[PDB]
Structure formats: C-alpha cells, structure tokens
Amino acid sequence: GLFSLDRSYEEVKAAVQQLQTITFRDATFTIPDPVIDQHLLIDMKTACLSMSMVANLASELTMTYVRKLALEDSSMLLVKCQELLMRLPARPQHVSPDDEIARLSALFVMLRQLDDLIREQVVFTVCDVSPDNKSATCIFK
Amino acid sequence: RNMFCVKPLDLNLDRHANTALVNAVNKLVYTGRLIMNVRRSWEELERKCLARIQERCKLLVKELRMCLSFDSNYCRNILKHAVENGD
C-alpha cells in the first residue's frame, strides 16, 4: 500500500513479484490481488500520522544511538542494519530523566498505535499439537 | 583602575567542552565579579574624596576662626553644612 503511491503500474508489477513470496516455516505462500482500497487508505493515513508523531517525539539520544554504537562496536547485525540508513566523543547538549521518561511513554504509545495495524488479534494459544500436525489444543476463546 | 569603561566578556568563556550549567554559571559569576568590582571601586573613591574634603572643612573652620570678622562669619556660615553626601 505504501509503495502504491506515485509509482508506475509496472513498478508495482515489479514489486509484487518481490513481495508475494512468503516462505514461512519451509512452506511457500502467495499474496492474492494486492489492490488499493479505502480501508487501506485509512491504514496508510494512520501509519503516516503515527510515523510523523514518532519522528517528532524522537529525542536526540534515540536518534544518535545507532551512530554512537556504530563508531565503536562491530557486528554483522550492526552492518546489516547500518546499510539501510543514510550517510550523515561529544557531550550531550541537554538530558533530563523526567522529561525523557515522558517522551518514552508517549513514544511507546505511538509505537503501539503503529503496532496495532499489523497485529490483528490473538484468538488461539496452542498447548499441544497432534504429532501428525493435523490437530491441536488451545485456550483463550 | 578605571570604573567608567565597561568591558563585558572580552575573550570567549562559552566553552562547549564543559557542562552548559557550568558555562552559564561561569558567565554569571563573571558578571557578579564585574558588578562587585565597580561597586567597591566607586565606594572607595567617594569615601577618599569625602574624607579629604571633610578634613579640608575642619582645617578651614580652624584657621578662619582666629580673626573675628563679618567675612569670617559669612564664610563660616557657608561652611557649617555637612559634607557626608553628594547632595
């Protein structure tokens, strides 16, 4: 949905061949007919609003922790998460505990308001499956 | 030495390498040192001037009083007023 905006139709046709292939738990799956919808517009609007809000409420230390770790530490996951970021010992300008815990609580609220889009609901909690993977037992109905 | 010319923040005391609270309180204590310096210099100059005009008044009212005359009476009656204040 976020890639459907301001893109050519063949760009979407070159994106669906990348995004339809899901190989979760050694079993392939395909996404049928990814089209535009007004509900999808609602999800995109709340996604962009929540992204703007968490971009605004991000403090400088949260914004600079990746560079502060990448200047000294070195790992494979740090490299794999650094290459998707952009290019551009100092003391922090102003820190405060009580302001930043409020910032982190509101930021957790905004990440929750982003998280609820992809997380639908829990409706089954499995305890024991059948060993032929054809049945299970569950709670929380 | 010269309490009349004001020289605020001549060289850079704002230093990013320290805490901004320490830098702000260092500029504050520079301003406090300046105001207490000009206060002390002003008060010491005026009490030096007032002390010497006081003793000039005492020596004059000593020396004019030996000869009784109307002129000495009038200049004494001018000189009766106090000299403890600028007014």
Side-chain angles (χ1 to χ4, degrees), chain B residues 4-63:
Chain B
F4 307 100
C5 320
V6 174
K7 277 82 66 179
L9 204 81
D10 305 358
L11 304 168
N12 185 3
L13 318 180
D14 192 283
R15 283 307 304 123
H16 198 248
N18 212 326
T19 311
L21 173 61
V22 181
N23 304 320
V25 79
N26 274 133
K27 207 152 58 171
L28 180 85
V29 70
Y30 165 67
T31 306
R33 202 79 78 97
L34 185 132
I35 182 181
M36 71 201 277
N37 277 320
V38 60
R39 268 295 160 159
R40 285 180 275 108
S41 59
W42 180 257
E43 59 83 22
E44 70 156 328
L45 264 291
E46 58 85 23
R47 50 186 163 70
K48 202 150 297 179
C49 293
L50 259 61
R52 289 194 186 271
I53 71 164
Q54 272 144 3
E55 60 95 9
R56 282 310 107 178
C57 176
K58 319 314 178 196
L59 269 73
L60 185 47
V61 80
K62 176 43 185 72
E63 200 204 317

Side-chain angles (χ1 to χ4, degrees), chain A:
Chain A
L2 266 298
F3 201 44
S4 88
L5 303 95
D6 207 78
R7 287 290 181 178
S8 85
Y9 202 89
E10 50 91 23
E11 276 149 2
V12 188
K13 289 193 303 274
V16 290
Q17 47 93 11
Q18 182 43 63
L19 283 181
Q20 274 185 337
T21 42
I22 295 96
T23 327
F24 167 71
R25 216 174 282 184
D26 315 329
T28 182
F29 285 99
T30 42
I31 292 174
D33 43 46
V35 302
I36 199 67
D37 199 293
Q38 327 301 292
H39 316 85
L40 194 66
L41 262 296
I42 295 308
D43 306 292
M44 284 186 279
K45 269 179 271 293
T46 180
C48 89
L49 166 62
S50 46
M51 188 170 304
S52 297
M53 213 53 62
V54 67
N56 180 36
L57 297 198
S59 70
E60 58 87 12
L61 57 95
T62 59
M63 278 300 314
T64 45
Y65 188 85
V66 284
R67 332 283 179 97
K68 280 183 286 202
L69 201 47
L71 57 86
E72 45 173 354
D73 215 339
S74 289
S75 77
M76 185 79 72
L77 55 99
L78 190 53
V79 160
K80 204 66 166 291
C81 69
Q82 200 203 24
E83 300 325 287
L84 54 96
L85 269 186
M86 57 161 47
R87 178 59 190 84
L88 298 186
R91 313 205 66 241
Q93 284 87 12
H94 42 84
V95 304
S96 156
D98 39 16
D99 171 275
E100 286 302 315
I101 54 185
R103 287 235 174 185
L104 263 294
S105 50
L107 193 137
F108 286 165
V109 165
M110 295 328 285
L111 296 169
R112 188 179 293 112
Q113 289 316 107
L114 198 44
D115 187 8
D116 62 335
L117 312 168
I118 41 176
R119 275 185 176 275
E120 176 165 325
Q121 202 178 3
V122 49
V123 62
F124 284 94
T125 54
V126 56
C127 283
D128 287 82
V129 301
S130 63
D132 62 331
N133 217 323
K134 283 202 177 175
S135 199
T137 178
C138 277
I139 336 169
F140 185 55
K141 300 298 297 293

